[PDB]
Symmetry: C3
């Protein structure tokens, strides 16, 4: 009965040691993860697609502007 | 005394089993978190507000440009 | 032999208690980390440098436009 208990104590001490190592590993894994406080949520930042869409809109207005300028330069050349 | 020790062994084995489970859960939770290496910090990316402010400044220059163009088109029409 | 086992049970219960506390701490650390689902990967967002580069390109086209407009206004003034 007493030798029995001893073998169970050994089993428990091994498991505890294995657990302590798992916990050490877990801590290191946690330190490689980004904190809420350092990362931007999706609400707080635009995606690449959203930015592309806004840049596109600007690009179209720039093209409209350039076509109008070219048309004006032409009108002026005809006046001269 | 020996039955006492036995009841404590049972308690310990239950706690250990419960701990092992907790650790299994924890690992899975960790895998749903973003790594520092894959996420952008706040100083590496602009917020929506910061982007809005920069887009606004561009828009004001566009409005100035378009007013000037419209005005020029009118000056030309009057010349013709 | 039996008092020996008792002192080992105490030693084990202390380790278990210490482990439980480590796990409690770990859980709280995990809740301060950003979830993949709430953060943007680097693939999904532009950096400040990337945005600056795109803004700069727009600003250069705006400068070119404003110089052309000024030049045009002057040509028109000379015609009148």
């Amino acid at each position: 009965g007493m030798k029995q208990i001893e073998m169970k104590i050994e089993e428990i001490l091994s498991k505890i040691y294995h657990i302590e190592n798992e916990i050490a590993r877990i801590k290191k894994l946690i330190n490689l993860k980004a904190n809420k406080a350092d990362a931007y949520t999706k609400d707080q930042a635009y995606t690449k697609t959203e930015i592309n869409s806004q840049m596109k809109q600007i690009e179209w207005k720039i093209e409209e502007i350039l076509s109008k300028i070219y048309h004006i330069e032409n009108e002026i050349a005809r006046i001269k």
